Design an enzyme around this catalytic site. Structure first.
Site, mmCIF file in Angstrom:
data_model
loop_
_atom_site.group_PDB
_atom_site.id
_atom_site.type_symbol
_atom_site.label_atom_id
_atom_site.label_comp_id
_atom_site.label_asym_id
_atom_site.label_seq_id
_atom_site.Cartn_x
_atom_site.Cartn_y
_atom_site.Cartn_z
ATOM 1 C CE1 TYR A 93 -3.718 2.336 0.684
ATOM 2 C CE2 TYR A 93 -2.815 2.680 2.873
ATOM 3 C CZ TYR A 93 -3.718 3.015 1.881
ATOM 4 O OH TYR A 93 -4.606 4.043 2.089
ATOM 5 C CG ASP A 134 -1.871 -4.229 5.075
ATOM 6 O OD1 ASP A 134 -2.983 -4.791 5.236
ATOM 7 O OD2 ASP A 134 -1.723 -3.004 4.884
ATOM 8 C CE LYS A 193 -9.190 -0.050 3.347
ATOM 9 N NZ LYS A 193 -8.816 1.267 3.859
HETATM 10 C C1 PLP Z 1 -4.126 -2.742 2.214
HETATM 11 C C2 PLP Z 1 -4.415 -1.499 2.997
HETATM 12 N N1 PLP Z 1 -3.691 -1.267 4.136
HETATM 13 C C3 PLP Z 1 -3.924 -0.127 4.863
HETATM 14 C C4 PLP Z 1 -4.893 0.783 4.456
HETATM 15 C C5 PLP Z 1 -5.022 2.001 5.337
HETATM 16 O O1 PLP Z 1 -6.179 1.968 6.116
HETATM 17 P P1 PLP Z 1 -6.777 3.367 6.671
HETATM 18 O O2 PLP Z 1 -7.367 4.104 5.513
HETATM 19 O O3 PLP Z 1 -7.714 2.906 7.757
HETATM 20 O O4 PLP Z 1 -5.639 4.192 7.251
HETATM 21 C C6 PLP Z 1 -5.663 0.581 3.287
HETATM 22 C C7 PLP Z 1 -6.392 1.750 2.612
HETATM 23 O O5 PLP Z 1 -7.089 1.704 1.564
HETATM 24 C C8 PLP Z 1 -5.380 -0.586 2.572
HETATM 25 O O6 PLP Z 1 -6.062 -0.838 1.424
#
Ligand code: PLP
Ligand code: PLP
Ligand code: PLP
Ligand code: PLP
Ligand code: CL
Ligand code: CL
Ligand code: MG
Ligand code: MG
Ligand code: MG
Ligand code: MG
Ligand code: MG
Ligand code: MG
Lengths: 391, 391, 391, 391
Positions: free
Chosen positions: B107, B181, B206
């Site tokens: 990400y 992740d 999510k």
């Molecule tokens: C794979 C992944 N990790 C982390 C995040 C970050 O999450 P947040 O928006 O709650 O900070 C997202 C954001 O789209 C994501 O898709």
């Protein structure tokens, strides 16, 4: 007037949509109707256009606008709690090789962030007595990047001479980042950014929330420091949820009438303790004779309700329990800034252990009081019964 | 079974006090009835006794217990969002001089944390192709401390061969900290800790929240890594509010039924796209032929609803607007994991710019879809109308 | 003292579980561990054991305990808003063939409930002047079941002589149910149940919530009337959600400091208006000369911030717009009791239409002010500019 | 399709302001910018303009729009719970001298409202067997104003022949108000207003909320009946808080996936019970041979998860405890419609007491099950262990 500003700050139609308070817009995803709208939102993603929930929704924008008005800043970054605001605001401005100068009366978690997190990242922290004033110039190094103030200090309540400290820093290192943990003043009893401090940090957990039931940190920066604060805190993922942002805005609306009561009651208690035969010292910024009281009177527009005093002796463990376990109105808990009165105790060596490179100047047990909204004569009677349990 | 565990995880009487769900205990201050109770709470301040709101209340403890059960961990740290969980979990395990080895499909905010925050704190970052498998051994340096996985990868959806990567890391650097992740799997379609990964990080924003209206990060660690994660995240002030914790626990209770629908619908869309004359490639872990599909089928128990595909041409700016501005069911927004279907587009060079030390292998415009809970035939009709606008 | 009672009412460990405030327990279903526990809960389902969410959760029980302490009652029933509390409390005590005797200054929705709902169910309603005092005896019929008071009255603010009314009712109809809408006093500035009134009803929407962002009704009954109120209101399905109950308890904690400011500011405004050349009359219970002021002085322990005044002319719609559209601090909205100052206008003929069987004794436009927490000199300047727009 | 409609109902930009879900607008006071705006809001105070919180805010308007779309109605009134919706919807249409004809399988609080509240206000109530069909015509009196259906019936699950009932009512009393408690179908598995019923009432507490943590009633009326329902319910002060309205809208977004799982699992359990040697009878609308099954098959588009069965004995107190106290997955609680499976027992004489003018035709203990989202084989094993404790 401040009370009028507190009632109205941040409450504009684009946020309230017709109610008195801002709407609560809960969101991660924020929807773009067209590619052109998405491009505009992207350009303005740190400038008040809806882009993504990590940047904020209308509810956050309303609080941020209120905080910038009330503290006279260019931007307000939001955090999950006060400790996160302190840690991430410092982190946003340092890199390997830098030096931080911090008051030795800083809140203990702030010190522990420096000594346990920053140290392993190659950032060194040095310390100063809170009354150092203009002599701070002698402690500034070529690599000093941040000067971290906390006035009044945690627990022992010493008030800095901010004008003298700032003028000395600016003579030697005008580009340094001067920060203050301004929680005790709720950001409004001491207008830090008007004194030439760059960033005013608060545990909004305390008086802004005002009811002991939310946690949130804020950091209001001047124009010079805002973009770095905003973008570096965002890279660490720092935000607060929309509902807590709403409750913080809501707390602003009673902050003035609450603080006036905390001031009136706490000063009355401090004056009474100062005359009491079982009290050695009272540490209250508003009480004459307290460390830095001169600077409180000159530089602040009021007091809150947190202070401490030193007993005429060192309580044994049995006396500590007899004293603390049997209050009817004061409760033992951490934090402060709510409607409830609180009490905690520390022995002198406990304080010495969180006064780096310094010693304490008292030997009795220290008692920290938060004076809430209860009737002050009832609180005095509770304190008097406590004194009778240890006399 | 997983559905039974999802319904019941974390819901014990100490937290629910008679309701189906945990109570929502909003607090900074937590009150100690006696000195002895305060001492007990202090000793157990990271072990499920009420101590201070920054450590958590009953509501947080219930969520943490649920996450540890579901992901098979020793502890679960909570954060204001997914990006904060990633940044602070990495930070918790590094010191100046260390090296991080991260998949080049991470990400983008995770990458930017490394290049813009870690680097200036003395921590370097290197990169690997997501299909590197056992050859990752050759990239482990003397100072490599953390190996950071993300499977499937962001946007382009490549699935790692986790068994091969882990075995290779453990051969060379047995004590390295391996993190993933695991947001796409919602922590439950891929049981990361069972594969020898040390820490499973999610954006609970999510699928766990599931409704696009809360933000929260989680990190579940094994026994070897828990104390360091817990205490270093706490020193950075990382926490989540009680209400969002409650809503995350609540999301778990429908996660199974939701995921099964996202899987069924997104695979049907992917299969249809793969046959479509205007589609060059489909990137869906469950679709035969997709990068790392073999490992998805072997190592996962299901799919979620997020994937991408590549068009048979590079859209012009006018075609991009005609395509994206005119969908009836799909919305343009960031994030994913909710009940609503979403669409975004990227040109190949946009992806190349977030693939460090690598090139992309496609030239058409890439479209990322989140398939929500709408009727799949309605979603297919919406996609078909989009194809007709650009054919 | 009242401030201490307000800070502490309803906060006991069974409800707070270690926090300062009660937990928020959201529930319909409440889970019985055993048949024995279900039997005990069933027996005690209106006596504070968890049984079903329509009866309440811990959060409701905490609020109910606080209200019973503060108003000196045997039980407190909860409702979705003040109007529901009024309608359902009256309904709980009438049957076909009964008569209700209500003050002609009652809140208009209360009157409309009587004339549009009760009338078609065979319950008649008669009316009395708010200053009738002991002469109400002549209006009591053999079938009069309920005598309904509201002091101060809605809009026009007349204060009843409650001792004289109650003594006359008890002489002629001792079993009658005497009720009061005690919203203006917030249940605490007039201790209705100590005056021999049976039920004190409030729109907790006003000062108890205190921030214009929740709606809730309460009715606190003496021992004689509690069971009938509780059970008949429950048969109508009346309840409030747990979160609004929490917010009402939370509002109690600042009610004292808020009311003192509303009293001080509103009386200062009233005194200024009473000498103003464009003002024909000021209706403020705390202002000497206002209707029923002598009873306010004798029977109340303070004032809130809502009152009205009559202009020296009946404004046209053009003058109303010039006046009301251009205030900087006062807003136009219904309801009151919050931190914001509000303004509304009523023409005399509109008031006449809601003064059944009576006449109005003024011809100018009536302005109702809610005085909030803004600085009073700022509010006075806003009112002065308003006067200049219509002079 | 229904899934697409459920995802999208009520979600328009005027309510969402850029987020996926509606904003949460908490308000009593709603602020008018000008006198002109106040006049427009007043004229449209029941037509979707912001006027006063008792009428609703944007959050309520969004839910109301969703409910009207999904149930095909002209308006949707909101209530603090299902029982309030039933009681106040009936009350809205009756006056002294009227008669109510209600199914004898109505939810017990609905019956008690009629026999304990309506009876003393001059409104009589008569009863009909749920399978009466066309023969209901013989029970309609000249003063019958309301005919009240509930299909499936409470506890015993009998499905009415609605087409036959409605045709008979319209042939004898075309102006009657036909109402149904349509909670079991969640308003969407049985499109009541398409069958010529005038008002569809639900305890949104059940499947619409879906998580056992909010209470709310809804009543969706056709154009003929809407104004009377809306205005008479408003005169009783009936409303729901904005946050629960938001959570009901949010529940709609997973209702389809949830209901499909509840149907699949509950029918499987019912089929197993129907061949079990310890079971005398199974009452499940979707099970062939259950009472009214043919009408369910013809008139409904699916099933939910609530049903009952009769054991092959009347359990003693010791057997009741052995059975009910020792389930691992089923919980004992009132209500239903959530993710958790629930169990309750009723003895035949308990049912007989709530079957006015009818007789029960079973003598074993009746067990009501709510089948949640747990794995069905785990639930079956829990039931089998229960059977072993009472064999
Ligand atoms: C794979 C992944 N990790 C982390 C995040 C970050 O999450 P947040 O928006 O709650 O900070 C997202 C954001 O789209 C994501 O898709
Ligand atoms: C001066 C000061 N700063 C910061 C904090 C930390 O705030 P929080 O507890 O919200 O992390 C506190 C905690 O008591 C504090 O007193
Ligand atoms: C005296 C009084 N009683 C009752 C109410 C009704 O309360 P609610 O608006 O919460 O129904 C109000 C409304 O302004 C009021 O002023
Ligand atoms: C069929 C039916 N109608 C109405 C209700 C009442 O709903 P509430 O509990 O929200 O008042 C219920 C309660 O279980 C119910 O089952
Ligand atoms: Cl410099
Ligand atoms: Cl190693
Ligand atoms: Mg936008
Ligand atoms: Mg107390
Ligand atoms: Mg859509
Ligand atoms: Mg204003
Ligand atoms: Mg016995
Ligand atoms: Mg269970």
């Amino acid at each position: 007037h401040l009370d009028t500003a507190l009632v109205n700050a941040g409450r504009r139609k684009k946020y309230t949509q017709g109610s008195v308070n801002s709407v609560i817009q809960r969101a991660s995803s924020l929807v773009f109707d067209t590619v052109e709208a998405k491009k505009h939102a992207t350009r303005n993603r740190a400038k008040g256009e809806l882009f993504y929930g990590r940047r904020g929704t209308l509810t956050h924008f309303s609080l941020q606008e209120a905080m910038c008005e009330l503290e006279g800043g260019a931007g307000c970054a939001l955090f999950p709690c006060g400790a996160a605001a302190v840690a991430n605001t410092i982190l946003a401005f340092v890199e390997q090789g830098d030096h931080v100068l911090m008051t030795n009366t800083a809140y203990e978690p702030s010190q522990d962030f420096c000594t346990k997190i920053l140290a392993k990242l190659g950032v060194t922290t040095g310390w100063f007595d809170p009354l150092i004033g203009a002599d701070i110039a002698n402690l500034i190094q070529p690599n000093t990047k941040v000067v971290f103030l906390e006035s009044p200090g945690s627990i022992t309540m010493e008030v800095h001479d901010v004008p003298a400290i700032v003028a000395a820093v600016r003579r030697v290192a005008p580009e340094a980042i001067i920060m203050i943990d301004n929680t005790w003043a709720a950001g409004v009893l001491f207008k830090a950014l008007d004194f030439g401090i760059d960033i005013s940090i608060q545990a909004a957990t305390k008086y802004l929330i005002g009811h002991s039931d939310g946690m949130i940190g804020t950091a209001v920066a001047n124009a010079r420091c805002w973009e770095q604060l905003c973008e570096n805190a965002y890279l660490m993922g720092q935000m607060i949820d929309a509902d807590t942002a709403y409750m913080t805005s809501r707390g602003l609306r009673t902050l003035g009438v609450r603080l006036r009561q905390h001031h009136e009651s706490s000063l009355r208690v401090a004056e009474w303790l100062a005359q009491h035969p079982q009290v050695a010292r009272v540490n209250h910024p508003a009480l004459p004779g307290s460390k830095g009281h001169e600077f409180w009177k000159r530089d602040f527009s009021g007091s809150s309700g947190l202070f401490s005093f030193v007993l005429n002796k060192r309580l044994t463990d049995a006396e500590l329990a007899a004293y603390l376990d049997n209050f009817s109105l004061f409760s033992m808990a951490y934090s402060w800034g709510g409607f409830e009165s609180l009490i905690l105790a520390n022995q002198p060596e406990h304080i010495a252990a969180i006064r780096p490179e310094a010693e304490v100047d008292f030997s009795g047990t220290l008692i920290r009081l938060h004076i809430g909204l209860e009737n002050v004569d009832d609180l005095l009677a509770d304190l008097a019964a406590g004194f009778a349990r240890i006399v």
